[PDB]
């Protein structure tokens, strides 16, 4: 049993597993926003 949850609010979202939070505009901007390989998703 493993039910992990995020640690961010509003349009912002947690950097996958990291403790970083990206803006809502991150949604398909043009390039990486996090740097770990998580925010890249949600854009193909
Ligand atoms: Ca991105």
- 25 C-alpha to ligand 1 centroid (Å): 9
Are 39 and 32 in contact by the 8 Å Cβ rule? The answer is yes
Place of tokens 């950097």: 15
Range of the domain at 17: 1-44
Rounded Cα distance between 37 and 10, Å, is 21
| Other CB atoms within 10 A of residue 22 CB | 19
Q: What is the CATH number of the domain that holds 41?
A: 4.10.400.10
- 4 C-alpha to ligand 1 centroid (Å): 23
- 44 C-alpha to ligand 1 centroid (Å): 10
List the determination method. NMR
- 1 C-alpha to ligand 1 centroid (Å): 31
User: In the chain, how many domains are there?
Assistant: 1
In Å, how far from its chain's centre is CA 14? 5
Sign of the torsion angle spanned by Cα atoms 42, 20, 16, 40 = positive
């Amino acid at each position: 049993g493993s039910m992990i949850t995020p640690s961010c609010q509003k349009g912002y979202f947690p950097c996958g597993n990291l403790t970083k939070c990206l803006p809502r505009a991150f949604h398909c901007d043009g390039k990486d926003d996090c740097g770990n390989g998580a925010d890249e998703e949600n854009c193909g």
